[PDB]
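User: Assemble these into one structure.

Assistant: Restating your components, then the assembled model:
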Amino acid sequence: TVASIVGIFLLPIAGISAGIPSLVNNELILHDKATSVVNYFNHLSESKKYGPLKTEDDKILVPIDDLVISEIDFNNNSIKLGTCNILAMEGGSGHTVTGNIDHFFSSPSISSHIPSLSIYSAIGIETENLDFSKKIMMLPNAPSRVFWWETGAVPGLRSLENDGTRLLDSIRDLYPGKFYWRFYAFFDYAITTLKPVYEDTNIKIKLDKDTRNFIMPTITTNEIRNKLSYSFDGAGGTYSLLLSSYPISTNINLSKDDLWIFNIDNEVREISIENGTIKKGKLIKDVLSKIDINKNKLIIGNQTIDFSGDIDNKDRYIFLTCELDDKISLIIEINLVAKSYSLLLSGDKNYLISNLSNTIEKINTLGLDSKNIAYNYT
Amino acid sequence: QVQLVESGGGLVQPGGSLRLSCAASGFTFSDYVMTWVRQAPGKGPEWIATINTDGSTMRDDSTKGRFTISRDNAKNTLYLQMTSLKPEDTALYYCARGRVISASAIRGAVRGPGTQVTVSS
């Protein structure tokens, strides 16, 4: 059991494939070139070619970068998608199309005063009878959004053809008269700029009775990360969550027999980004000096975990885990109702008892009370 | 006993650059990671960046390039280089000890009074 706790990755940060936006004149620009914009839609089209989740290294389910998944249901093997819209067009006159190149006598105009258009409706993403055989999954990283956008004069784009232009054409064809991404009106114009306006997005994870392990994505854009929250519905299984040093709001709906494990190794350690991935360093001094425990809320450094459901259960313990050495694991046994914790050190008996002094120093460096400690030898 | 005091703010014209600094005393500076935060009225505190004891950094990528955190351990000083300032950057900028990113962690941080940065037209 604590063995399963101790049994609980070079995955990239969010945006390595979809792009990480930039703040330009006080608004977020995801992409600012026609070909870059088209490439974003090409990336999105992967959800159709590969499904909403990819399987990396035959061990972990990874959603498409920037795909808005609003619900994951492990009971019904299903997904719900959130909002991924783009502003519609109105007006224009004399529309024709020649060689799949739209032409206008007078060009249409983009408006935020009429209903926006669903990009995902034009993809037709499979959301049912999914394979949730892998018990490790990276959580989705994408809040709902409406893409504001702009056209500009862009010549030489008439021969561009790929899965991105196909998807953009699919949007045009699905909402006739309301979307044109490349068109001639005395000059050649095209979409040049993608400007997401993100929306608060709660992602509901409906768990089954099984062992489910979750990796929280590393989202380096504050304005994206702050629109996201995860809400887990416990079903009495064994659940682990690897928290990111870039925190995301998380609520846990506790069921009677849930075993919850939170891997805090990123939260207690120096973090930097190298080659699009997390680089872990040494432990942070006093990072756990003010753990805040309440029946409905746990505060661990920059992490805030809210709790609902069976929150008045006096008998439940949850566990925080991290690595002190390459051979010794620290488990923080937390009772939310008692507002209390104790410590468990786990490792090989010979090694652990040898390095006991060193290990208790690390605990004290982390800011933890070292007064209640149990020892589990392997 | 811990002291943190920021300097370097002021009225700046749009497009200008500014280097903030924070002097520290009362603890072993090099043993801590250090954070820059900014706070404008009507918003929560905004985490800018944290610098590790090895000089590596963790940062918000919307501040990417324009804001750069650095440290000089011998001078017990944290720096924030700011580039191409804009009116939306107007806030009180302050230093916090440790890695403080969430609102509660920032509001409970060991921090300096801040240095005001005002960019306007």
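Chain A touches chain B at residues 15, 20-23, 25-26, 28, 220-223, 245-247, 270-273, 279, 281-282, 284-287, 290, 299, 301-304 (CB under 8 Å).
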